[PDB]
XYZ file of C-alpha atoms in Angstrom:
497
model
C 95.921 125.257 28.463
C 96.244 125.301 24.685
C 98.919 122.710 25.348
C 98.167 119.090 26.135
C 100.144 116.047 27.189
C 99.200 112.550 26.201
C 100.983 109.237 25.918
C 102.009 106.590 23.422
C 103.831 103.282 23.941
C 106.744 104.313 21.641
C 108.253 107.311 19.944
C 106.553 108.326 16.678
C 109.497 107.165 14.552
C 111.155 109.085 11.733
C 107.802 110.052 10.132
C 108.497 108.826 6.649
C 105.058 109.248 5.081
C 105.618 106.305 2.724
C 106.910 103.550 5.005
C 105.477 101.335 7.785
C 107.245 100.292 11.027
C 108.531 102.014 13.058
C 106.461 105.011 11.843
C 103.346 105.461 13.983
C 100.282 105.951 11.816
C 98.614 108.619 14.012
C 101.750 110.785 13.761
C 102.070 110.355 9.968
C 98.429 111.485 9.801
C 99.161 114.546 11.959
C 101.917 115.779 9.661
C 101.015 114.516 6.168
C 97.801 115.014 4.166
C 95.883 113.188 1.336
C 94.508 114.568 -1.909
C 91.037 113.784 -0.570
C 89.768 113.229 2.934
C 87.734 110.359 4.350
C 84.507 111.266 6.220
C 82.436 109.357 8.792
C 79.623 108.859 6.227
C 81.976 106.834 4.021
C 82.500 109.520 1.408
C 85.591 111.604 0.764
C 85.853 115.362 0.448
C 88.223 117.597 -1.487
C 91.383 118.177 0.536
C 94.757 118.948 -1.119
C 92.761 118.393 -4.315
C 89.930 120.870 -4.835
C 88.126 118.843 -7.447
C 88.563 115.989 -9.916
C 87.244 114.478 -13.096
C 87.538 110.984 -14.513
C 87.385 109.539 -18.005
C 84.375 107.546 -19.212
C 86.187 104.232 -18.834
C 87.038 105.130 -15.197
C 90.772 104.648 -15.717
C 92.052 108.223 -16.040
C 91.652 110.744 -13.229
C 92.557 114.435 -13.222
C 92.870 116.269 -9.945
C 92.808 120.033 -9.748
C 95.006 120.881 -6.744
C 94.662 123.796 -4.348
C 97.039 126.578 -5.289
C 97.536 128.108 -1.894
C 99.180 125.191 -0.066
C 102.689 125.279 1.316
C 104.769 122.605 3.027
C 105.647 123.661 6.595
C 109.070 124.724 5.324
C 107.602 127.270 2.914
C 108.127 125.170 -0.234
C 105.025 124.995 -2.446
C 102.772 121.970 -2.718
C 101.991 121.561 -6.452
C 101.329 118.783 -8.955
C 105.027 118.297 -9.488
C 105.529 117.667 -5.796
C 102.573 115.304 -5.774
C 103.757 113.336 -8.810
C 107.261 112.975 -7.271
C 105.669 111.569 -4.145
C 103.704 109.001 -6.154
C 106.908 108.056 -7.916
C 108.704 107.629 -4.596
C 105.915 105.414 -3.275
C 105.649 103.244 -6.408
C 109.423 102.752 -6.542
C 108.728 100.687 -3.446
C 105.542 99.253 -4.842
C 106.340 95.697 -3.786
C 105.952 96.750 -0.155
C 102.470 98.127 -0.935
C 101.034 95.167 -2.829
C 98.529 94.349 -0.063
C 96.816 97.603 -1.122
C 95.299 97.201 -4.558
C 95.579 100.903 -5.509
C 99.366 100.439 -5.472
C 99.085 97.715 -8.102
C 96.570 99.710 -10.074
C 98.444 102.917 -10.679
C 100.185 102.810 -14.048
C 101.083 106.479 -14.466
C 101.109 109.738 -12.508
C 102.090 113.040 -14.131
C 101.767 116.727 -13.518
C 99.877 118.367 -16.384
C 100.546 121.757 -14.850
C 101.232 123.313 -11.448
C 97.638 122.617 -10.479
C 96.596 119.596 -12.560
C 97.583 116.071 -11.506
C 96.758 113.097 -13.770
C 96.601 109.554 -12.452
C 96.064 106.593 -14.739
C 94.900 103.178 -13.489
C 95.023 99.797 -15.176
C 91.307 99.255 -14.443
C 88.279 101.170 -13.130
C 89.294 100.654 -9.484
C 86.212 101.642 -7.425
C 87.890 102.234 -4.033
C 90.359 104.663 -5.676
C 89.413 107.728 -3.614
C 89.131 105.885 -0.321
C 92.650 104.497 -0.661
C 94.093 107.913 -1.555
C 92.568 108.997 1.766
C 94.455 106.463 3.940
C 97.139 107.571 6.449
C 99.796 105.902 4.236
C 101.332 105.541 1.794
C 99.750 108.145 -0.487
C 100.534 111.349 1.458
C 102.980 114.159 0.656
C 106.345 115.091 1.972
C 108.325 118.059 0.548
C 110.365 116.592 -2.309
C 113.347 118.620 -1.119
C 113.375 116.154 1.775
C 113.844 112.963 -0.313
C 117.230 111.213 0.067
C 118.988 110.388 -3.206
C 115.722 111.077 -5.101
C 113.761 108.512 -3.087
C 111.872 108.058 0.205
C 112.115 104.274 0.360
C 115.604 104.524 1.813
C 114.773 107.313 4.252
C 113.989 111.013 4.316
C 115.651 114.166 5.663
C 113.269 116.336 7.689
C 109.618 115.110 8.009
C 108.077 118.132 6.196
C 104.406 117.808 5.437
C 101.558 120.213 4.692
C 99.465 119.270 7.717
C 98.353 121.242 10.804
C 101.089 119.760 13.040
C 104.838 119.895 12.838
C 107.209 117.571 14.697
C 109.098 119.874 17.022
C 111.417 117.432 18.707
C 111.669 113.726 19.431
C 113.339 112.707 22.700
C 113.906 108.934 22.676
C 112.082 107.045 25.466
C 110.894 110.326 26.905
C 108.562 112.229 24.627
C 107.736 113.566 21.183
C 106.545 117.129 20.798
C 104.375 118.507 18.036
C 103.420 122.138 17.632
C 100.703 123.784 15.561
C 101.603 124.681 11.964
C 101.178 128.443 12.017
C 101.159 128.566 8.228
C 98.663 125.756 7.671
C 96.405 126.185 4.615
C 93.349 125.085 6.549
C 91.555 125.552 9.874
C 93.868 126.562 12.758
C 93.786 124.027 15.637
C 93.016 125.541 19.041
C 95.704 123.376 20.653
C 99.202 124.845 20.083
C 101.363 122.028 21.415
C 100.971 118.325 21.999
C 103.491 116.301 24.046
C 103.481 112.479 23.772
C 105.059 110.880 26.777
C 106.522 107.493 25.863
C 104.823 104.990 28.200
C 104.788 101.372 26.993
C 102.918 99.753 29.881
C 99.090 99.896 30.030
C 99.004 100.145 33.833
C 101.672 102.845 33.889
C 99.638 104.866 31.368
C 96.643 104.662 33.728
C 98.814 105.702 36.665
C 100.258 108.544 34.584
C 96.755 109.724 33.970
C 95.564 109.260 37.578
C 98.427 111.399 38.883
C 97.735 114.086 36.358
C 101.022 113.659 34.481
C 99.096 113.260 31.191
C 95.845 114.959 30.099
C 94.506 112.450 27.592
C 94.530 108.834 26.496
C 92.924 107.860 23.145
C 93.071 104.384 21.614
C 91.561 100.958 21.159
C 90.849 98.213 23.701
C 94.533 98.002 24.687
C 94.671 101.668 25.761
C 94.661 100.881 29.482
C 93.424 98.081 31.733
C 89.693 97.712 31.271
C 88.844 97.285 34.968
C 90.653 100.610 35.546
C 88.755 102.143 32.592
C 85.462 101.008 34.197
C 86.522 102.529 37.531
C 87.523 105.835 35.815
C 84.082 106.020 34.155
C 82.406 106.247 37.576
C 84.847 108.792 39.038
C 83.593 112.417 38.535
C 87.173 113.702 38.679
C 87.813 112.117 35.284
C 86.108 111.993 31.889
C 85.794 108.814 29.848
C 84.237 107.860 26.527
C 83.535 104.658 24.600
C 82.792 105.000 20.838
C 80.524 102.837 18.752
C 82.419 99.804 17.404
C 85.057 100.299 14.740
C 86.353 96.794 13.845
C 86.296 93.059 14.558
C 88.571 90.983 16.753
C 88.536 87.298 15.698
C 90.549 84.115 15.444
C 91.640 82.937 11.975
C 91.490 79.162 11.730
C 93.958 77.341 9.548
C 91.909 75.469 6.958
C 95.142 73.905 5.622
C 96.417 72.441 8.919
C 94.993 69.494 10.883
C 92.737 69.409 12.754
C 91.383 72.848 11.753
C 91.517 71.655 8.159
C 88.173 69.890 8.866
C 85.013 71.911 8.333
C 83.304 70.003 11.147
C 86.008 71.015 13.581
C 85.914 74.697 12.625
C 82.139 74.651 12.943
C 82.334 73.084 16.411
C 84.905 75.637 17.542
C 82.458 78.319 16.403
C 79.850 77.002 18.895
C 82.358 76.459 21.718
C 83.271 79.887 22.963
C 80.931 81.633 25.377
C 81.499 85.085 23.910
C 79.228 87.064 26.224
C 80.993 85.536 29.202
C 84.412 86.186 27.706
C 83.516 89.817 27.090
C 82.012 90.129 30.625
C 84.943 88.344 32.225
C 88.028 89.571 30.441
C 86.804 92.777 28.793
C 84.710 94.195 31.580
C 81.670 94.366 29.343
C 83.088 97.172 27.181
C 82.882 95.403 23.803
C 80.162 93.701 21.756
C 79.754 90.050 20.799
C 80.626 89.435 17.137
C 78.890 86.627 15.185
C 80.381 87.486 11.768
C 83.754 88.626 10.267
C 82.239 92.075 9.618
C 79.467 93.637 11.671
C 76.094 94.010 9.796
C 76.650 97.798 9.828
C 79.747 97.439 7.619
C 79.163 98.467 3.990
C 78.108 95.509 1.777
C 77.992 93.233 4.849
C 74.310 93.225 5.885
C 73.788 89.689 4.529
C 71.700 87.947 7.143
C 74.477 85.423 7.844
C 73.447 82.809 10.422
C 75.253 83.135 13.814
C 76.689 80.208 15.661
C 75.588 80.883 19.265
C 77.430 79.425 22.215
C 76.182 75.810 22.259
C 78.594 73.267 23.669
C 76.129 70.430 23.130
C 75.973 71.214 19.425
C 79.777 71.574 19.266
C 80.134 68.077 20.807
C 77.639 66.542 18.404
C 79.505 68.069 15.434
C 82.784 66.590 16.674
C 81.223 63.169 17.434
C 79.540 62.992 14.017
C 82.932 63.752 12.408
C 84.556 60.857 14.286
C 86.214 62.874 17.056
C 85.248 60.762 20.059
C 86.527 60.564 23.641
C 88.659 57.550 24.681
C 87.846 56.000 28.042
C 89.162 58.113 30.948
C 90.168 61.028 28.663
C 88.780 64.537 28.187
C 90.467 65.213 24.845
C 88.972 63.728 21.670
C 90.876 61.655 19.148
C 90.356 60.499 15.572
C 92.605 58.127 13.575
C 94.935 57.958 16.539
C 95.427 61.737 16.499
C 94.296 63.824 19.527
C 92.214 66.930 18.951
C 95.024 69.392 19.637
C 95.242 72.950 18.342
C 97.801 75.711 18.801
C 96.579 79.231 19.508
C 99.091 81.973 18.648
C 99.115 85.579 19.863
C 101.539 88.335 20.859
C 102.725 86.972 24.214
C 103.299 90.383 25.825
C 99.721 91.381 25.047
C 97.965 91.010 28.421
C 94.504 91.258 26.919
C 95.149 88.704 24.141
C 96.573 86.387 26.744
C 93.464 86.672 28.954
C 91.117 86.002 26.058
C 93.301 83.080 25.004
C 93.051 81.420 28.436
C 89.296 81.766 28.349
C 89.145 80.339 24.825
C 91.440 77.426 25.815
C 89.138 76.595 28.745
C 85.889 76.827 26.747
C 87.357 74.556 24.071
C 88.568 72.002 26.598
C 84.914 71.696 27.730
C 84.110 70.290 24.281
C 87.130 67.936 24.129
C 89.632 70.091 22.254
C 93.148 70.576 23.570
C 94.280 74.079 22.790
C 97.955 74.895 23.433
C 98.836 78.551 23.960
C 101.747 79.899 21.927
C 102.477 83.491 22.960
C 105.503 84.993 21.160
C 107.084 88.326 20.191
C 105.613 90.285 17.255
C 108.217 89.239 14.687
C 107.654 85.593 15.479
C 103.864 86.032 15.209
C 104.209 87.960 11.983
C 106.370 85.189 10.533
C 103.620 82.673 11.403
C 100.945 84.757 9.691
C 103.012 84.760 6.506
C 103.995 81.111 6.407
C 100.850 79.536 7.859
C 102.525 78.000 10.961
C 99.468 78.426 13.153
C 96.331 76.509 14.090
C 94.383 79.487 15.344
C 95.709 82.998 15.520
C 94.350 86.249 17.001
C 93.474 88.690 14.247
C 91.401 91.794 13.670
C 89.896 93.744 10.794
C 91.018 97.248 9.937
C 88.060 99.554 10.474
C 86.947 102.320 8.120
C 87.695 102.863 5.279
C 89.607 99.573 4.931
C 86.661 97.311 5.782
C 85.651 95.365 3.796
C 87.324 96.086 0.467
C 90.994 96.490 1.554
C 90.796 93.687 4.132
C 89.481 91.384 1.390
C 91.974 92.622 -1.199
C 94.650 91.696 1.298
C 93.411 88.090 1.563
C 95.038 87.502 -1.805
C 98.608 87.855 -0.577
C 100.658 86.282 2.297
C 101.307 89.140 4.731
C 98.416 88.948 7.123
C 97.217 85.489 8.050
C 94.093 85.425 5.894
C 95.749 84.092 2.755
C 97.354 81.235 4.693
C 94.258 80.566 6.805
C 92.214 80.126 3.608
C 94.633 77.921 1.678
C 92.771 74.743 2.546
C 89.530 75.822 0.848
C 88.703 74.258 -2.537
C 87.146 77.598 -3.500
C 90.106 79.780 -2.471
C 91.054 80.438 -6.124
C 87.434 81.385 -6.944
C 87.306 83.616 -3.850
C 90.537 85.461 -4.836
C 89.242 85.882 -8.369
C 85.954 87.348 -7.119
C 87.888 89.685 -4.818
C 89.809 90.897 -7.888
C 86.505 91.347 -9.756
C 84.533 93.161 -7.064
C 87.215 95.845 -6.670
C 86.745 96.823 -10.335
C 82.992 96.414 -10.559
C 80.821 99.477 -11.148
C 77.655 97.512 -11.764
C 76.320 97.964 -8.217
C 74.190 94.816 -8.368
C 77.177 92.654 -9.322
C 79.371 94.340 -6.670
C 76.867 93.469 -3.956
C 76.510 89.994 -5.349
C 80.248 89.442 -5.328
C 80.636 90.717 -1.716
C 77.789 88.502 -0.620
C 79.374 85.439 -2.250
C 82.811 86.131 -0.789
C 81.618 86.872 2.746
C 79.047 84.039 2.670
C 81.669 81.505 1.620
C 84.054 82.694 4.340
C 81.240 82.459 6.865
C 79.903 79.030 5.791
C 83.384 77.579 5.624
C 84.031 78.776 9.201
C 87.359 80.382 8.339
C 87.081 82.780 11.288
C 85.903 82.631 14.902
C 84.580 86.167 15.407
C 84.910 87.230 19.069
C 83.850 90.857 19.462
C 83.490 94.223 17.799
C 85.744 96.671 19.626
C 85.406 100.409 20.223
C 87.768 103.340 20.633
C 88.196 104.516 24.229
C 89.044 107.848 25.736
C 90.196 108.954 29.169
C 90.738 112.690 29.706
C 90.853 115.569 32.158
C 87.395 117.126 32.233
C 88.759 120.560 31.216
C 89.472 119.221 27.707
C 85.722 118.732 27.132
C 84.128 116.180 24.778
C 86.736 114.405 22.693
C 85.678 113.860 19.039
C 86.462 110.752 17.032
C 88.361 110.733 13.755
C 86.586 108.753 11.001
C 89.758 106.729 10.429
C 90.408 104.512 13.470
C 94.154 105.002 13.493
C 93.877 108.792 13.467
C 93.501 111.072 16.464
C 91.557 114.310 15.883
C 93.799 116.624 17.879
C 92.932 119.553 15.539
C 89.310 119.294 16.705
C 90.076 119.373 20.399
C 88.647 122.689 21.617
C 88.610 122.955 25.427
């Protein structure tokens, strides 16, 4: 009643607030809290910090913390506790370099029990937004550090948030209960059980049979045909949010044949996106023409779409000297056939379906795409070392898009750095990314974003496919399910049946 049961593909992990895999972000966000909180309108509000001031040069920030906050174990949250957390994070700073705030922070110190001072090496504009992220800048009770650190593990996952991990039963379920001593609003739900269910179809079956009350996630939540069927069945409730992020291919500008502008341009006219969405996605997503949707901050640039046009694709390839030998359907140039490898997580049924469609569309224009589906670790390795022709990718949703996604293009962890290595203006782009993040002249900031996104668009680095939405399937008794502003978060505390 005031207890609900939902599902997740894996256990939540140890809930170290400062580390990545195998910690599940939604669970870190349930237990741990930020100094300031991200809102749908793009702003942040006071959270663990009541208020703040900054110096004139924008480099020194002083946060006045709430004085009534306790960790779930009764220990006080104060500036000392906050400063220790920042220390623990930055001791592992190499692991956070994709996130520019982690490179920017030069000092953190408690000026008193309620005053926290953070010094940056430049006037980093997205400072507050990055403090608001699910990780790594959230607070565990320092008593729960191991050997004065968190980077090598924690003891109990003690946060200040409205949920407390009750128990974690491997391959069965994770249980969270309401924090009865939470500083803020008391959630109506008292207990949330996450059944561990890795298979999309099995999750749907689990819901159909009534075993679980709620499913909340992105386009991989459950099979989309089943989602469509559920939406017409009055016994169930379903929701589909407005789009939150882009799904796209990254094309390797430093590997033949995607190293050729003409090829990447042709590939951008080759995919019938509407058909792909209608066919493989059951019409539940939107066609994307650009890396970021026009509704993304700084991204309403009037970039010119490349609409499905196989005739144009062919002309582009022919003009570039990719012509068809007699009796063949695959183009060649300088002896070399027009062959391209498409990489994706092989156990991702949706990615695989989209890949087959893309392979077929590209064959129609004389390009031989080979599908390379592999396990995560193998795909991740490819992202880092640039061993891909085309690779499935996605942006990160609010508040990461666009600033943090772009920041990340500067380092080899996601594929973007590798994908862009073949561009003569890659150094210029990376420099401008550095600049825009520290620009407070609003005209220059917009100018820099325009130049960066326009170069990426004109150089055909990406093949945008669709903008995807969050999806919800729930027992009607739970009522309308709200969305959390941050795509990886689940607003359990706002569920009020």
